[PDB]
Amino acid sequence: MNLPTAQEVQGLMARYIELVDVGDIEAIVQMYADDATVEDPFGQPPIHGREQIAAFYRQGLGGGKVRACLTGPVRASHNGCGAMPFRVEMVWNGQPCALDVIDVMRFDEHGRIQTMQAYWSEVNLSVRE
Amino acid sequence: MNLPTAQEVQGLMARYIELVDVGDIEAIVQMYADDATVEDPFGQPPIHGREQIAAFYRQGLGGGKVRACLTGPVRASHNGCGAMPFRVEMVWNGQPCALDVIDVMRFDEHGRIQTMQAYWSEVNLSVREP
Numbered sequence A: 001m002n003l004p005t006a007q008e009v010q011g012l013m014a015r016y017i018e019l020v021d022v023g024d025i026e027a028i029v030q031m032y033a034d035d036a037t038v039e040d041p042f043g044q045p046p047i048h049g050r051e052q053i054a055a056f057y058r059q060g061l062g063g064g065k066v067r068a069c070l071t072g073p074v075r076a077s078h079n080g081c082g083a084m085p086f087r088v089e090m091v092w093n094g095q096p097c098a099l100d101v102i103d104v105m106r107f108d109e110h111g112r113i114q115t116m117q118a119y120w121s122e123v124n125l126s127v128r129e
Numbered sequence B: 001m002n003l004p005t006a007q008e009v010q011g012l013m014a015r016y017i018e019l020v021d022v023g024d025i026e027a028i029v030q031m032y033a034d035d036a037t038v039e040d041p042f043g044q045p046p047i048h049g050r051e052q053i054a055a056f057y058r059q060g061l062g063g064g065k066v067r068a069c070l071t072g073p074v075r076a077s078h079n080g081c082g083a084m085p086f087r088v089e090m091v092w093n094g095q096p097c098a099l100d101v102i103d104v105m106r107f108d109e110h111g112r113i114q115t116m117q118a119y120w121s122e123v124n125l126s127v128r129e130p
């Protein structure tokens, strides 16, 4: 793949959600360019390169009990960037919860993720009331 | 207001769509910083200049038949930023249409939009069922 077109970005970003949904760490990390960055949440220090990004997904996901699902379409540009809204389901205080997140992802020429930025906070965490 | 809290982001961003939907250009342009930038769509170069931004909202909304509504929660950071998903309704090519967009914003200590970036392209355009 060359630089993804809009249409390609949409496909790549959907794929990435499934891969979080099924917890495949090696297939996610392989989607990232070798020298990519993660900011998640945006505002925290970035993470640099595949070693540091695999250590991140293994912390966040490795324990299981995390599902994800797109909660609308992928918005996609003509420069290799897109953004998507989704919901994470996991466990908070021994019980289910939902976290609502938006990721913005810039791709390089090769169809991999150069930069990821995940917009969420505690205001986006919900439970059963 | 100083950077805005996350809860506060959220308010500035829902209020902003509320304004877009009502079509108040001058209300919309004031929410910005003297030196704000818009990138809409992301990837097209920034515009800049309060006047360069009123004309942006004047070109975009000046018929009065645009509508806009959040389609899920604003996602806000603790560093004065947020992201939001919304759906724009308008007529184009004689057809009832809709556009799905995500805007990313930052703000300033005073709660003025400092940057904005609107993610969307023609892949997000569609025709509304009858």
Ligand SMILES: C[C@]12CCC(=O)C=C1CC[C@@H]1[C@@H]2CC[C@]2(C)C(=O)CC[C@@H]12
Residues within 6 Å of the ligand: A020, A040, A059, A060, A061, A066, A088, A090, A099, A101, A103, A118, A120
């Ligand atoms: C890494 C992650 C998924 C991939 C993605 O793109 C965005 C996020 C951000 C929220 C993470 C989540 C994984 C599960 C996490 C670690 C929790 O249990 C608390 C916060 C949450």
Ligand SMILES: C[C@]12CCC(=O)C=C1CC[C@@H]1[C@@H]2CC[C@]2(C)C(=O)CC[C@@H]12
Residues within 6 Å of the ligand: B020, B040, B059, B060, B061, B066, B088, B090, B092, B099, B101, B103, B118, B120
């Ligand atoms: C300016 C705008 C609303 C405010 C906002 O926050 C983001 C956008 C970007 C898409 C614009 C839309 C207004 C209506 C436009 C001009 C169309 O008819 C096609 C593209 C679309």
Ligand SMILES: [Cl-]
Residues within 6 Å of the ligand: A071, A072, A073, A085, B071, B072, B085, B086, B100
């Ligand atoms: Cl949506």
Ligand SMILES: [Cl-]
Residues within 6 Å of the ligand: A071, A072, A085, A086, A100, B071, B072, B073, B085
């Ligand atoms: Cl949503």
Ligand SMILES: [Mg+2]
Residues within 6 Å of the ligand: A018, A021, A022
């Ligand atoms: Mg699945």
Ligand SMILES: [Mg+2]
Residues within 6 Å of the ligand: A033, A108
């Ligand atoms: Mg490279």
